[PDB]
Structures are given as structure tokens and as C-alpha cells.
């Protein structure tokens, strides 16, 4: 492939460099339309800019935490972090979010990796070996109420059991209700006067509940869960302007008030170098 | 003697002529078309009013003055009240449509000024409150009036800050969306053909707008000496290939 | 039972590896795809669309005005604007090009810089745009500027001029984050003759300026952007 | 070799090697030729 | 292959052993040009002197250390070794360095092995099990500021998570900007009067940041990281004189003052055996 | 699931072993090679060039 | 001995995965099947039989 | 596979929607027996409702 | 590839792709045609 | 068998078995024959 062809002096009536940008086109002008060039080859394919590659590496999408401790006398397991749920999202930690929102609709399978590490912040004789249970709870399933409910039987709901310190990995097909996930949605769920704007089920990817299977030892053990997400089989439509201001909320476009100028001011003139 | 410059668009019972065009944009290089069976889901036969809905509606005019910040209309909202297009809209459960948008602004060879005319698929607005405040329905359904970016923040309304496109992105990059400029010195109209763009084959016309049309002054209007300091901008829009499905009782929407 | 040996790296999680995994939802059938206009396949497809450069960066809060390069009637010989070419920083940084370049470590290729004139139709002007390849200072006067890559632009019916910064380089890749060894030059613009307004007209006229990449362009070695960060996880 | 039955479980896809910027860079209705005048 | 051919008495006008070294050549003289030889075969190929073999074994290129401890009240994580970076180099530990600098330009893929072991120098009830995170931070990426910054999300930057006591292994393609890495560079980054000499980006191989993912236990744990580097697919040009004096700095050729004579003095005469 | 048995040596790191590894930079394209005079392939090539001997070591 | 590398997820138990296992009862012979009317193959077969709706829910 | 065929107005002596449930059958009535439909395809096989799948986790 | 000798040890079965609701939805002795009168 | 997609991930290269010291041992412009006089 040639990156530049050889081209010499020109004295024409045919001027490729004068255009009318009002038309909305970006005319494909090249170095050889306005200087004299020599042949050179590309030596490159643009492999690593493919959208499959761009969205295809694992990104941290969620960090939560649960603890193993005596539940005796706990009136609210959920509240003691005896167990914890997470409604899956890709817009809570901003790194991956800005990447996805370069597109309007996106379609892909997900590969999840879940790393779990334990901490024992206060005096323990040892490090126990805990098994985590991660249950995938689709909308309409009974939700766990205690850390050892009938729910955890999970007879119809996919669940994975792995050890703290290890990693669990499985992949979920594209679960969207429509043909693509909406990265944006300028609508409501119905014509209600007060219903929420922008947040939609069109994006919904399920939800996940974590708990330790082990009963309690004498000390307490903090287990912190990190969920990583990798898109595989990516398809993206309609590019948009990149995110400039900071994010404030999952699912709305809102930016913070009295934010700071995002364009760097010159130290000098327009004329400055 | 054909120029890129003169054009005629006849759609239904209405025709537009421009003698100072700058080509026309067809979003994503695709022209509006009906919904193919292979893509269909709802089993209902659809209704295609054709020429009674696919004609040109001219919205009320705006006034560009030296202080203007820009205006924003949503589709199909802007047309919610135009003739039979609008009736069909409130009466069917689902509908689908593409449009021809023609924005008009003429001046003289002594004026200067340049407007950006852009179509943004799925333009989800931001609340000026920040945090996770929502933007109420009425605020994103201004109707033919559209939203005036130089109007004041209101409560439950969107933010109207132009350098941020009403969503946290910079004005400068709106050029990645199908768009055309109106530069008084060149141009006097902008025309964009919009194919139907959605993640579902057909949708509700009232709970979801699928494009915002935005006209934004970028190089300020500058009139000749002792000229009146303003020009009107007119927007005429025509639904094209419209289909309605799931007819019934007639939606009632807030406000 | 087949005898195996495990190698160093067993059990590691590399966020960039690509392997098979069990599906949690065995036998599930995804929604059919329907057609949607606009599919993107390569980021190289989109960085060829031009977007506006806030060249007039001299303001103090972001404003529509930093996209406008002003022009003065009747000045002769003088300089319209200047900038270095660190596409990952400074004016370029918020543009779509700048914004994507920042997802990669290295770039190579030609850039296309165009200027669209917005002055009254009955005015006229001749400007010179000059690209100064690495190795010399930003030009200080047109004489200096005109000895490097340049285009005399004659403002006419055809409203925009497209200047190309041809890839001039020893090393075949440069860093997107500004680096010296790897630096690309300067871009300046001067009056060639001068802007002239018709009667009954007055004041400043402005140029809009765009940037996009030529088909020439290469970007490689993906990394994280300095353009976005956060202090606590967001919630709904 | 796929070891698993479902398609979601396969590795990353392989390069589009599609690439056609014209839907984004030249969505004009009447074709523009480089070198010919923009507005006739 | 014959190592020596058979050759007998000679009384010629053709003298292969008289040459003129001023010419710059090393004339290919053999035993059989000056004594009577018998046939013998080589029995050898020179396999283990191939440059791929010479540069192809893992060498320790870096030892760093980080600790897991309560960051509460630490004003400078980087400074507490709460996390640590390393800008990749092959010229800090001298063994591999002398080997590479036998050549001027070198081109190869790298295979890294990272061994991490833990130490608990002061009273602990137990040994905890820590997971290390090694992030590859290319120039221009945000750099970690705390041990748990958004940076560590590493949504676009390759990172590996492995356990202390284990090893991590991955391989990076040749990331040089030019066609080869310069082992030497007699230049500057620009014609500045005070810019640094010799050190160049032409050599730059990225940079790496390490941290423990675990929160803190009651005791403190020292984790010491050793990075090993193996060249694979080696290509080397222009041999040079081997390094004689000791090294003082990464990237400069400088040797220490009042160094010692590097040539061993005879214990005796020139005539001595 | 195929039945396996691991042998002695599993998990060891031998600095001299030669195996495959995942690439950290999937799909990256290295700079083209250009021609450079002087390529060395074997150390046996270079030890045939003669160099001076500090024979007079007595200093 | 063939060189291997284990990936993330090793040792996990996913209630939805489908693999082979050793039989605890090697060589056992199950009872022959006889014919029984009524075999169901898909839940989609049965949701097409209509059943009564307690529409008058007001009790 | 078609999920619905195209069907238009009807004015017949052949009424598929009147039945006698006392018989114990569930007559296979479709949308196209009582409204005008357009063609649409199933795009689906009913894989995940197989009893092997239902009892197999 | 089965690694084991017994049939119980193989993975899950594969979709019936049988599907015939008529034993449940139309177990009538004399065949009913849709469109013809239910009771003659 | 390569298990991985990228070339960097393959094992060590295989012996040049190239070997030609003359660029280093005899870079003279006019060819010298062993046995013939060095300087004529």
C-alpha cells in the first residue's frame, strides 16, 4: 500500500485544495495535492484501532465489599455487608464509560472476571479460606434477604462459587432487550409528567449478588470484590463528540455546576507558539 | 447549467426552491426507507398516509440577533401539531419516520455570520442542577417552539450552555454529526435528509424523540452599517416515509 | 491421565489476553440485529471527519469565541495566529482528533488543517499559511515563514482552504504526549496582502479552523487518556 | 478450537478490516469531485 | 565439515602468512598454512553463540518494593511505597547491560517474568495472601497518585493481577519508535545548549506501576518485586568494543574517576611466562 | 473436562526455558525494519576480527 | 510432560456450565425405558394449553 | 420461519375464532385470524425452554 | 471427545428440537378443523 | 503450535545459521587473495 505517491510541480485550473466546508463534507485532501512528494508505503494496517480491539480489554467496572462475621443479632444482613448486590452498569467508573460513549448504540457479549481479596484489619490468628458465591439475579427473581436465604439455592439462576484470592470468569451473551444497548436515550418510560428522563431499561444488563459461603470464625474478615468487564464481538453505531466535562451520575449526561474551563488558555497571544 | 446551488424539493403537495444551496447532507449516507419485514417485530399491518403526512411543515420563525445563543428542536416533537402528521402521532401506539430538514436564512453581500445546522441522534440533555436531577418531560417536549438556548435556566428543564451541547461535550466536536453550515457569504439554506435511526424497528412517538435539530450562530451576525441588527431564521421540515402502527384511543401526554 | 507441567504465569489475569469462557446463560437467544445507519469499524474512520479547533484560546472561561480567529482590515505584512503542533495538547487537545490521539501512545501521518472564511461576500483577502518542520523556531515574520511549507490562500467564492501538514520526520513515529525529540513543528498564518472590507461595512471578520487526519495516519499502542478521571464511583 | 457450545463464549472477534469513512466524511447528496469547484 | 584438511611440506613463492595489517583486514589464515596437518572434522555448529541464544535467557532487570499497610494519614502513597512505578530500562543492573552493549542497535520482542515474594520483618500472626497488580503505563497516560486512584481501573492500559509468591509472565512486542533500539546515541533531543546528551527516547520501552490490591491487615507486609527480561526474535547490528570500566549511570557511557587499571600487570617481565 | 496429572517442576521459572506467552499489546504494529549495514548473527563471526593485545603489561 | 498455563476462572464452580465427569457407578446398567404417553420436550409445548384465569379476583 | 403471515380484510362464512372449549381442545388461533397482519419472522428457536436446559443447571 | 467410558458421564443432551403440543392442546378423538364449526 | 495470535508471543527464534564474518574481517575495497602479496 502506498502512503504517498510521487507527485511533481502543478500549474493547473484544477485546484483540489479550495473547497466549501459549508457542505458538511471533509474532502479527502493529501500531501501530494499541495507539495511535491516521493513514494512511501504504509507498512501498517490499523489493526489496533478496530472497535473490537478498542473495547476488547478488561476494565474495572465495580468494586464492592462484603464481610464474614457472626450474623447473630444482625437485623439487616444487607446493611451489615453480610452480603451485597450490584445492578450491572458500565457507567459508574469513568474510564470505560468515556470509551463506550464515543458511540450511541453498542452491541457485544461480555466476559466478566471477578477478583476477590481478603483483608483482616484487626488482630486475627490467621487468614481463613473463604469461598465467595456470585449469583446473577435477573429482574423478577426473588432477591436475597439474609446471607443464607432460600434464594441462594439458585436453582434456576446462574451462580459461580470461587475462593477469595482467586478469580472467577464466565461470559454472558448480549442480554439487551433491543438490537443494541442505548448509550444514550432522549426519552422516558412513558408519557408521565414526573417520570425519570434518560435512564432506561434499554441498557439493563442484569444484576449480581455476592456473599461468603463460610460461617464465621472468631475474627472478622473483609472481602473486597472487583468486577472487570471485557466486550467481545463488538458492534458500534453512530459516533458522537467525546465527553468533555466530568460525570455526576450513572445514566444522565449531567455535568457539575461551576465546573472549570476545559479548554487550556494560552500563556500568551493567539500569535504565540 | 445545474449548480450545486439551485435546488427544488417537491414532497407531497409542497415544494421548496433554493437558489443558493451548498449541496445537501444525507445522514450517514442513507436515505429514508420503510421498515422491511426481515426487521419487523410487531405483527400489525402499518398505515402509510403518504402524501398527507409527507409534505413540508414550516415552523414559526426565529430571530437571529447579535446576542443569540442558538435554538434546539426535537423530532418528532416539533411536528406534534402539524396537520394529519400530528393526529396520526397521538392516535397510534407506534410510528416511524425520516425527514427532510430545510433551514433558511438570507441576508445580503454586506452581512457576515455563520450558523451550524446539525442533527444529533439520541440527544439526551443534561439537567443544569448537576448530580442526578432529571429533566422533566415538558422541558424536552417544547413542540414547535423548540428550546431557546439563550432563555434562562428553569426548574426541571435542561442546561442551555452552548459550549457544551446541552450534554457535557464541546461545541467544536458537533461536526462529527451530519451537519451543514449557513455562511451568509456562501449559503442561504441548509438541507439534511434524516433516515430513521433507532435500536428498535419502530417506537413510541411521544415518549422518545430520536433526533434534535440544532441551529447555532458560531460567527456572530454582523450587519452592514445602520442596517437593522437582526435576520429571521425559518425551519421547514417534512416527514418522509412515515408509517404508523397500533391504532387505538389517542394518547394523553403531560401538560 | 495425560502428564502436564504448568509454566510461570499460570493463574495470572492479564486484562488484555483473549480466551474462551463458559457462558453463564447456556442456550439463550439474543435479540435479532436490525439495520441502523452509521456503523463505525475503526477509530481511523472517524478521525478523518474534521472538527473545529478552539484556536483563539486566549479567553478565560470556555466560550464560543475561542473558535473564532479574528482578522483586521487593512493590516499588511502581519501575523494572524501561531501554534506548535503538539496534537495531544494545547489547541488540538479537545478536538476529536486530539481526543482520540490521546487514547494512543504513538502517531504518524499527515494532518489536514483548513480555514473557512466568514467575512462579507464583497470583501477580499490573501493569507499565507506556513508549516515549519521541526528544527527551526516558530517563524517570527512572513519572510521567515514563507521559506517552509506554505499555501497563498486567495479568499473567494470557494470559502475554505485545506492545508496539509505533510509528514516530515526522521523517526517514523512521534509521541502523542508532547516530547522534544519527537516534536513536529509550528503552524503560522500572515496577511499576504491584507483583508479589505466593502463600504458600509466594519469591524472584525473571523475565520473558523478545522483539523482532521489524512488517510496516511497511523496511531498505535493504546493507553489511558489524561482527559478523564474521577474521585468516587458514581451512582444512580 | 472452540471448547464451548455457545457463541458468546468464543474469544474476541478479528479485524473488521472494513473501513469506509465516507458515511462520515462525505455524506453529501450530490457527489463532490476533488479538484472540481465545490460550488458551481 | 572439515575443521582441518591434510597438508604437507611447502616450498613456495606463495606465502599466505605474510600480510599487511595496515589494510584493516584480518586475513583468514589457518593451521594448515604454516604446519603440516591431518584431516579432522568440526563436529560442531556454533548453535549457542547465535545472538538469539546469547540474548535469549531471562536476566534480572529490576528489583523494587512496595508494602501493604494502613494508608490512613499517609500524605504521599508513592513515598510510603504504598505503590511504586519503574520506567523500563535494561541498563540499570549491569550483567545484561554489558551483553547488549556489544551491539549498537538491537531489535527484539520482550518476554517479562515478574516474581513477587513477601517478607514480614516484624511480628505477624500470619502471612496474608496478597494479589499484586502491575500496570503498563505508556507515556501520556495518567500516572497513579494514590494506591487506589481511578488510574488503577486501567480500562485502556494492559495490567496483570497475580499473587505474591507466584510469578506473572506476558510478552510485549518491540515497542521502539525507530527500526531498532539505540544502544548508543551521540546526539541530543534538539539543538539546545543545556539539553541532556546521550539519554534518548530512542530506547524508551514504556514504564510499569505496581501496587497490592489487598486492603491492610493488622501487621505490615513487605513485598519485593523482581522483573526478569528475555529477548526473543533478536536482531543486532554493528558490533563494538566490550565495556571495560564500571558503569555509573543509566544511559551515559561515563565511568568513575580514579578507577583502577583494568589490564592486569605482569608479575615479572615482558619475558615472563 | 480432560484428565491431567502435573509433574515435578510445575510452576518453576527456569531463566533458560523458551515458551509462548500472551502479548500484553494485542494487535500492535511494530515499526518497519529499514536496512542497516553491519548485522551480527553469531559471536563466532566477530571473534575472527583481530584486536591488539596489551602484551607489554609491565606498566 | 506437556507445558500448560492455567487461566483466570480455574477451579471455579459455575452452576450452569456443562462438562463431563467420572461415573461413580462404573458399568451399571439402567432399567430399560418402557413407553409412557405424555412426554414433554419444551416448556413452549405446554404454555399453549389454555387454563382458567381467576379474573374475578375481588374476593 | 414466519412468526406472522400477511393477512387482509375477511368477510367469510368460515369463522376460526368461534369454538367450543367444552371439547377439551385449545384451538390454534393466531393474530392473523382476527386482525390484518404483515409478515414477520421468528428469529428464535426455543432452545432455552428445552426440558434438558430447564432441569440441567 | 468423551474422556470417560460410561454414558452418564457425558455432558448435557442437545435440544430435543422435538416440539409437538398437539398431545396436550388437541387430544380430541374426532379431528377439529379451525374455521369449521366446533359442534356440527 | 502457536496458541496465541500475535507474533511477539511465540518462542525464541531458531539459529540464524547465517554467519559471514567478511563484513567485519575483510571490508577492503580491492579484494585480497591469501598467498598473493598484500601490497603490490
> In 3D, which of C60, C55, C205, C63 has the Cα closest to residue B69?
C63
CB C209 within 8 A of CB C114: yes
Neighbours of C, requiring at least 3 CB pairs below 8 Å, are A, B, D, E, F, G, H
> In 3D, which of C109, C151, C116 has the Cα closest to residue C130?
C151
Q: Is residue F41 within 8 angstroms of chain J, CB to CB?
A: yes
Q: Quick check: do H and D touch, 3+ CB pairs under 8 A?
A: no
- For residue E46, what is its C-alpha cell? 556454533
Query: Sign of the CA dihedral E196, E198, E199, E204?
Result: positive
Torsion of CA C13, C19, C22, C24, to 10 degrees: 70
The residues of A whose Cβ lies within 8 A of any Cβ of E are 57, 59-60, 93-96, 99, 115, 117-127, 165, 167, 222, 224, 226
Which of E59, E266, E271 to mutate: most F Cβ within 10 Å? E266
Task: Output helix, strand, coil percentages for chain J, rounded to the nearest 5.
Answer: 20, 5, 80
Q: Strand F4-6's sheet: what is its strand order?
A: F4-6, C2-6, G2-4
CB F32 within 8 A of CB C32: no
Q: How far is CA A258 from CA A11, A84, A245, A262, in A?
A: 55, 35, 11, 12
Query: 3-class SS at H35?
Result: coil
β C126-132/E221-239 pair status? unpaired
Rounded CA separation B96/E5 (Å): 92
Give the domain ranges of chain I: 1-40
CATH of domain C1-236: 2.60.120.20
Residue G43 host element (H or E): helix G43-46
Provide DSSP, chain C. -EEEEEPTTTT-EETT------BSSTT--PPPP---S-EE-BHHHHTTS-EE--TTTTSSS--GGGSEEEE-BT--S-EEEEEE--TTSGGGGGSHHHHHHTTEEEEES-EEEEEEE-S-TT-B-EEEEEEE-BTBPPPSSHHHHHTSEEEEEE-SSS-EEEEEE----SSS-EESS--STT---EEEEEESS-BBPPTT--S-EEEEEEEEE-TT-EEEEE---TT---SS----
**F·I CB contacts under 8 A:** 4
Rounded CA separation B4/A23 (Å): 10
Residue whose entry in the numeric block shows the C-alpha cell 493507553: C223
Phi, psi of C100 (to 5 degrees): -85, -40
CATH of domain I1-40: 4.10.80.10
Rounded CA separation B238/A238 (Å): 23
Q: How far is CA A181 from CA A52, A201, B56, B122, in A?
A: 16, 9, 33, 12
Q: Quick check: do B and F touch, 3+ CB pairs under 8 A?
A: no
How many Å separate Cα F37 from the centre of its chain? 21
Residue whose entry in the numeric block shows the C-alpha cell 469506509: D20
Chain E residues lying within 8 Å of F41, measured CB to CB: 50-51
Q: Residues 4-33, chain I: which have Cβ within 8 Å of G?
A: 4-6, 8-12, 16, 18-21, 23-25
How many Å separate Cα A118 from the centre of its chain? 25
- For residue F51, what is its C-alpha cell? 584486536
For chain I, the straight-line distance linking the first and the last C-alpha, in angstroms and rounded, comes to 58
Kindly report the number of other CB atoms within 10 A of residue H23's CB atom: 16
Rounded CA separation B25/B16 (Å): 16
Q: How far is CA F5 from CA C9, E37, E179, H3, in A?
A: 18, 57, 45, 52
CB A161 within 8 A of CB A131: yes
> In 3D, which of A130, A95, A69 has the Cα closest to residue A247?
A95
Which residues make Cβ contacts (< 8 Å) with residue B188, sequence separation at least 6?
B18, B19, B20, B21, B104, B105, B106, B107, B182
Rounded CA separation B88/B96 (Å): 11
Residue whose entry in the numeric block shows the C-alpha cell 402509510: B48
> In 3D, which of C25, C12, G12 has the Cα closest to residue A132?
G12
Instruction: Give the nearest chain G residue to I25 (CA atoms).
Output: G49
Rounded CA separation J34/E23 (Å): 13
> In 3D, which of B186, I16, C19, H3 has the Cα closest to residue A21?
B186
Query: 3-class SS at B234?
Result: strand
Which among F1, F7, F19 has CB closest to G1? F7
| Long-range Cβ contact pairs of C70-73 (< 8 A, separation 24 or more) | C70/A270, C70/C204, C70/C205, C70/C206, C71/C119, C71/C125, C71/C195, C71/C204, C71/C205, C71/C206, C71/C207, C72/C195, C72/C204, C73/C123, C73/C194, C73/C195, C73/C196, C73/C197, C73/C205
Rounded CA separation C3/B70 (Å): 72
Beta-bridge mates of residue E105: E182, E237
> In 3D, which of C48, C39, C128, C122 has the Cα closest to residue C81?
C128
Each residue of C168-200: b (16+ CB within 10 Å) or e?
A: bbebbbbbbbbbebbbbbbbbbbbbebbebeee
Torsion of CA H1, H6, H12, H13, to 10 degrees: 0
Beta-bridge mates of residue D37: none
For chain H, the straight-line distance linking the first and the last C-alpha, in angstroms and rounded, comes to 29
Distance from CA of A192 to the nearest CA of B (A): 6
CB E254 within 8 A of CB F46: no
Half-sphere exposure of residue C84: CA atoms within 13 angstroms, side-chain side = 19
CATH of E1-273, one of 2.60.120.20, 3.40.50.2300, 1.10.10.10, 1.10.1060.10: 2.60.120.20
Torsion of CA E124, E126, E129, E134, to 10 degrees: 20
Resolution (angstroms) equals: 3.0
Beta-bridge mates of residue E50: F42
**Angle at Cα A195 formed by Cα A194 and Cα A200, nearest 5°?**
160
Phi, psi of F14 (to 5 degrees): -105, 115
> In 3D, which of J35, B24, E267 has the Cα closest to residue A23?
B24
CB C128 within 8 A of CB C145: yes
Q: Is residue C129 exposed (0-12), middle (13-18) or buried (19+ Cβ within 10 Å)?
A: buried
CATH number reported for the structural domain that contains residue B62 in this entry:
2.60.120.20
Which among J7, J35, J39 has CB closest to E20? J39
- For residue E103, what is its C-alpha cell? 551491539
Is H21 close to G16, i.e. CB distance below 8 A? no
Give B132's DSSP letter: T
Rounded CA separation C104/C99 (Å): 10
Q: Is residue C14 within 8 angstroms of chain F, CB to CB?
A: yes
Instruction: Give the nearest chain D residue to B180 (CA atoms).
Output: D28
Q: Is residue F18 within 8 angstroms of chain C, CB to CB?
A: no
Rounded CA separation E86/B40 (Å): 56
Distance from CA of J10 to the nearest CA of F (A): 5
**Angle at Cα A157 formed by Cα A151 and Cα A160, nearest 5°?**
95
CB B160 within 8 A of CB B153: yes
Rounded CA separation A177/A190 (Å): 17
Kindly report the number of other CB atoms within 10 A of residue E233's CB atom: 20
**Angle at Cα C168 formed by Cα C68 and Cα C153, nearest 5°?**
40
For chain E, the straight-line distance linking the first and the last C-alpha, in angstroms and rounded, comes to 36
Q: Quick check: do B and D touch, 3+ CB pairs under 8 A?
A: yes
- For residue C44, what is its C-alpha cell? 481511523
> In 3D, which of C214, C115, C105, C102 has the Cα closest to residue C166?
C214
Neighbours of H, requiring at least 3 CB pairs below 8 Å, are A, B, C, G, I
β A221-239/A59-68 pair status? antiparallel
CB C204 within 8 A of CB C72: yes
Give B59's DSSP letter: P
Torsion of CA A151, A152, A157, A159, to 10 degrees: 160
Rounded CA separation E130/E163 (Å): 6
CB C118 within 8 A of CB C105: no
Beta-bridge mates of residue E4: E40
Q: Is residue C21 exposed (0-12), middle (13-18) or buried (19+ Cβ within 10 Å)?
A: buried
Which among F21, F40, F49 has CB closest to E171? F21
Amino acid at each position: 500500500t502506498v502512503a504517498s505517491i510521487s507527485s511533481g510541480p502543478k500549474h493547473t485550473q484544477k485546484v483540489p485544495i479550495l473547497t466549501a466546508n459549508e457542505t458538511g463534507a471533509t474532502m479527502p485532501v493529501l500531501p501530494s495535492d499541495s507539495i511535491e512528494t516521493r513514494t512511501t508505503y504504509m507498512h501498517f494496517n490499523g489493526s489496533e484501532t478496530d472497535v473490537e480491539c478498542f473495547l476488547g480489554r478488561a476494565a474495572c467496572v465495580h468494586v464492592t465489599e462484603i464481610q464474614n462475621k457472626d450474623a447473630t443479632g444482625i437485623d439487616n444482613h444487607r446493611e451489615a455487608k453480610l452480603f451485597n448486590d450490584w445492578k450491572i452498569n458500565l457507567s459508574s467508573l469513568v474510564q470505560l464509560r468515556k470509551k463506550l460513549e464515543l458511540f450511541t448504540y453498542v452491541r457485544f457479549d461480555s466476559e466478566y472476571t471477578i477478583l476477590a481479596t481478603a483483608s483482616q484489619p484487626d488482630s486475627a490468628n490467621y487468614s481463613s479460606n473463604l469461598v465467595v458465591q456470585a449469583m446473577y439475579v435477573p429482574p423478577g427473581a426473588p432477591n436475597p434477604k439474609e446471607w443464607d436465604d432460600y434464594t441462594w439455592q439458585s436453582a434456576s439462576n446462574p451462580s459461580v462459587f470461587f475462593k477469595v484470592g482467586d478469580t472467577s470468569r464466565f461470559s454472558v451473551p448480549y442480554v439487551g432487550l433491543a438490537s443494541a444497548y442505548n448509550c444514550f436515550y432522549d426519552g422516558y418510560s412513558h408519557d408521565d409528567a414526573e417520570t425519570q428522563y434518560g435512564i432506561t431499561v434499554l441498557n439493563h444488563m442484569g444484576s449480581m449478588a455476592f456473599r461468603i459461603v463460610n460461617e464465621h470464625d472468631e475474627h472478622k474478615t473483609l472481602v473486597k470484590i472487583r468486577v472487570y468487564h471485557r466486550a467481545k464481538h463488538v458492534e458500534a453505531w453512530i459516533p458522537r463528540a467525546p465527553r468533555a466535562l466530568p460525570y455526576t451520575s450513572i445514566g444522565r449526561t449531567n455535568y457539575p455546576k461551576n465546573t472549570e474551563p476545559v479548554i487550556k488558555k494560552r500563556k500568551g497571544d493567539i500569535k504565540s507558539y | 447549467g445545474y449548480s450545486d446551488r439551485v435546488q427544488q424539493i417537491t414532497l407531497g403537495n409542497s415544494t421548496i426552491t433554493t437558489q443558493e444551496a451548498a449541496n445537501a447532507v444525507v445522514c450517514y449516507a442513507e436515505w429514508p426507507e420503510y421498515l422491511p419485514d426481515v426487521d419487523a417485530s410487531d405483527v400489525n399491518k402499518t398505515s402509510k398516509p403518504d402524501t398527507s403526512v409527507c409534505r413540508f411543515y414550516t415552523l414559526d420563525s426565529k430571530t437571529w440577533t447579535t446576542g443569540s445563543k442558538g435554538w434546539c428542536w426535537k423530532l418528532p416533537d416539533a411536528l406534534k401539531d402539524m396537520g394529519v402528521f400530528g393526529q396520526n402521532m397521538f392516535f397510534h401506539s407506534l410510528g416511524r419516520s425520516g425527514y427532510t430538514v430545510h433551514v433558511q436564512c438570507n441576508a445580503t453581500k454586506f452581512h457576515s455570520g455563520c450558523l451550524l445546522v446539525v442533527v444529533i441522534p439520541e440527544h439526551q440533555l443534561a439537567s443544569h442542577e448537576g448530580g442526578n436531577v432529571s429533566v422533566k418531560y415538558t422541558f424536552t417536549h417544547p413542540g414547535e417552539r423548540g428550546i431557546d438556548l439563550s432563555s434562562a435556566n428553569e426548574v426541571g428543564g435542561p442546561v442551555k450552555d452552548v459550549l457544551y451541547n446541552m450534554n457535557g461535550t464541546l461545541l467544536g466536536n458537533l461536526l462529527i454529526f451530519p451537519h451543514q453550515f449557513i455562511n451568509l457569504r456562501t449559503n442561504n439554506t441548509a438541507t439534511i435528509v434524516i433516515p430513521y435511526i433507532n435500536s428498535v424497528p419502530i417506537d413510541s412517538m411521544t415518549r422518545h424523540n430520536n433526533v434534535s435539530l440544532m441551529v447555532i450562530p458560531i460567527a456572530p451576525l454582523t450587519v452592514p452599517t445602520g442596517a437593522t441588527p437582526s435576520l429571521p431564521i425559518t425551519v421547514t421540515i417534512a416527514p418522509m416515509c412515515t408509517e404508523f402502527s397500533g391504532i387505538r384511543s389517542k394518547s394523553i401526554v403531560p401538560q | 491421565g495425560l502428564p502436564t507441567t504448568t509454566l510461570p504465569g499460570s493463574g495470572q489475569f492479564l486484562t488484555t489476553d483473549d480466551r474462551q469462557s463458559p457462558s453463564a446463560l447456556p442456550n439463550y437467544e439474543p435479540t435479532p440485529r436490525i439495520h441502523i445507519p452509521g456503523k463505525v469499524h475503526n477509530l481511523l474512520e472517524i478521525i478523518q471527519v474534521d472538527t473545529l479547533i478552539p484556536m483563539n484560546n486566549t479567553h478565560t472561561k470556555d466560550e464560543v469565541n475561542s473558535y473564532l480567529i479574528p482578522l483586521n482590515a487593512n493590516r499588511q505584512n502581519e501575523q494572524v495566529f501561531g501554534t506548535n503542533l503538539f496534537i495531544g495538547d494545547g489547541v488540538f487537545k479537545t478536538t476529536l482528533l486530539g481526543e482520540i490521539v490521546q487514547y494512543y501512545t504513538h502517531w504518524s501521518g499527515s494532518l489536514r488543517f483548513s480555514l473557512m472564511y466568514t467575512g462579507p461576500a464583497l470583501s477580499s483577502a490573501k493569507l499565507i499559511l506556513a508549516y515549519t518542520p521541526p528544527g527551526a523556531r516558530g517563524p517570527q515574520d512572513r519572510r521567515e515563514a514563507m521559506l517552509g511549507t506554505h499555501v497563498v490562500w486567495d479568499i473567494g467564492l470557494q470559502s475554505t482552504i485545506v492545508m496539509t501538514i505533510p509528514w516530515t520526520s526522521g523517526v517514523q513515529f512521534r509521541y502523542t504526549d508532547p516530547d522534544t525529540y519527537t516534536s513536529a513543528g509550528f503552524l503560522s498564518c500572515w496577511y499576504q496582502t491584507s483583508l479589505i472590507l466593502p463600504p458600509e461595512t466594519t469591524g472584525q471578520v473571523y475565520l473558523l479552523s478545522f483539523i482532521s487526519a489524512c488517510p496516511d495516519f497511523k496511531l498505535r499502542l493504546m493507553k489511558d487518556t489524561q482527559t478523564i478521571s474521577q474521585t468516587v464511583a458514581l451512582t444512580e | 478450537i472452540n471448547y464451548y457450545k455457545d457463541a458468546a463464549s468464543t474469544s474476541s472477534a478479528g479485524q473488521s478490516l472494513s473501513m469506509d469513512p465516507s458515511k462520515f466524511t462525505e455524506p453529501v447528496k450530490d457527489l463532490m469531485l476533488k479538484g472540481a469547484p465545490a460550488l458551481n
